[PDB]
Design a protein around this ligand. Structure first.
Ligand code: O59
Ligand code: CL
Ligand code: ZN
Length: 258
């Protein structure tokens, strides 16, 4: 057996193999907009994805990862609450079976249809492996997805999903520009958290954008055609691969805007 999002291996079961699931800085969390406080110490956020080099897209049995070449400082995230440079390594999404759910973070308890996670690691630690052994090893830029108008920049991702329907399948995915997945505004909320999937390591500085991007019903419907299962096995649609909000505990969510 292995962790997943089913009734028998879902979020409520994770703590048995990953005790940190009940830790002090777990993610995601509900973002109470009225309790979040504007933080003047936050520096301007810098998303520099101009030289991003995508390589492959993979169905890992939980979601699909668009992987990037992080052997050189190309796609980096800096500024904001971040100290130093964080390099983009991959991005993936979390989505629901219906438009009314799918996101991991929530805003005033509101759930979006999906959530995009752009994962970056602190270059001061040399590699991703070492970074996840540090309290400030990672920075994940989270972007909410709502259903409405199509997102042109997402279509290339959608059209390749048919080739990676099942767990373990991958496909070349070069020259994809992640800048086409960003909303207009970079206003955000930030707080110290963790990976939202096992191992649930608490090494993440979360930066969640306030402005969601709009994707079409057709685009998200194709996300829902993916499979959690591997080839030749009974079909288990890849839907609702999101972890619910976790206790905030000793943390404050800061806003980059007034
Ligand atoms: N949803 S999230 O963005 O918070 O996180 C997803 C998992 C990200 C990958 C985590 C892999 C952890 C194992 O790293 S290792 N082998 O030790 O280098
Ligand atoms: Cl199921
Ligand atoms: Zn994620």
């Amino acid at each position: 057996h292995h962790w997943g999002y089913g009734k028998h291996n879902g979020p409520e079961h994770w703590h048995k193999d990953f005790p940190i699931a009940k830790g002090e800085r777990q993610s995601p969390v509900d973002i109470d907009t009225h309790t979040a406080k504007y933080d003047p110490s936050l520096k301007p956020l810098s998303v520099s994805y101009d030289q991003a080099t995508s390589l492959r897209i993979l169905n890992n049995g939980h979601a699909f990862n668009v992987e990037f070449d992080d052997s050189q400082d190309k796609a980096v995230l800096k500024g904001g609450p971040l100290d130093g440079t964080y390099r983009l390594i991959q991005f993936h999404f979390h989505w629901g079976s219906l438009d009314g759910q799918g996101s991991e973070h929530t805003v005033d308890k509101k759930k979006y249809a999906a959530e995009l996670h752009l994962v970056h690691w602190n270059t001061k630690y040399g590699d991703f492996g070492k970074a996840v052994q540090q309290p400030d090893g990672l920075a994940v830029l989270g972007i909410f997805l709502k259903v409405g108008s199509a997102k042109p920049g997402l279509q290339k991702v959608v059209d390749v999903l048919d080739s990676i329907k099942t767990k373990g399948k991958s496909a070349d995915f070069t020259n994809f520009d992640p800048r086409g997945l960003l909303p207009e505004s970079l206003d955000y909320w930030t707080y110290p958290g963790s990976l939202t999937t096992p191992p649930l390591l608490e090494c993440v500085t979360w930066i969640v954008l306030k402005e969601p991007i709009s994707v079409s019903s057709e685009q998200v419907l194709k996300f829902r055609k993916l499979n959690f299962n591997g080839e030749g096995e009974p079909e288990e649609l890849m839907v609702d691969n999101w972890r619910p909000a976790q206790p905030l505990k000793n943390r404050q969510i800061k806003a980059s805007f007034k």
